[PDB]
From a paper:
Two interactions unique to Retriever further promote [name] binding and regulate its function. Mutation of this interface with [name](I761G) or complete deletion induced >50% reduction in [name] interaction (with CCC complex retained), while reciprocal mutant [name](L67D) reduced binding to [name] by approximately 30%. Incorporation of [name] into Retriever is therefore mutually exclusive with its ability to function in canonical Retromer-mediated transport, which also explains why synthetic macrocyclic peptides targeting the conserved pocket on [name] interact with Retromer but not Retriever.
It comprises two sub-assemblies: Retriever composed of [name], VPS26C, and [name]; and the CCC complex which contains twelve subunits: COMMD1-COMMD10 and the coiled-coil domain-containing (CCDC) proteins CCDC22 and CCDC93. The COMMD proteins form a distinctive hetero-decameric ring stabilized by extensive interactions with CCDC22 and CCDC93. These adopt a coiled-coil structure that connects the CCC and Retriever assemblies and recruits a 16th subunit, DENND10, to form the complete Commander complex.
Author numbering:
A (entry chain X): 24 to 38
B (entry chain Z): 0 to 182
Write the structure that this text describes.
Amino acid sequence: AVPLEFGDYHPLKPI
Amino acid sequence: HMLVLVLGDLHIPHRCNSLPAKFKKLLVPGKIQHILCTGNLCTKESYDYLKTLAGDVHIVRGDFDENLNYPEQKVVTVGQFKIGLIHGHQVIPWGDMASLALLQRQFDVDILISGHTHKFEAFEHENKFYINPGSATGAYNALETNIIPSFVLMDIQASTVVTYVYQLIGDDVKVERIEYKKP
């Protein structure tokens, strides 16, 4: 697995 | 997208008293469609919590679960994927890759989910996908106490699964991504 950066989508990212 | 929460080895209340606060802030109602739990909730407190997150909750029996009604294993279909679920204390020696590949063959699944080791893994072997979410609370295991709290969220659409791994490490939530395509 690849670590995500600040801008990247993930499903629990607040919106 | 079908969102599946994968978690287990909570060991609440005997080893840990709750999920990390930063995990609870992220895990909110209304987003998750299915929960696949490797077991060792040990108690109804945690089952009840999972039901706040999604209606469709699947648990398999852990070696420390109070609830004996949970099935030992389960096979489910989400999107195009056949997924197998087992706690994995039945794997001898613990976490053995040959043992996991043997369970994959016995269940005939595209994705095998198992627990027990309290160590996260997400990898493709012989074109099959293997997931272990770790312990969502960072509960100690039979060998070790430096356990990183973690869980997985699979985002399934058709032939593609994107697996997001959430870890509480360095006091912060770290997210990692891996992708698997059905052959």
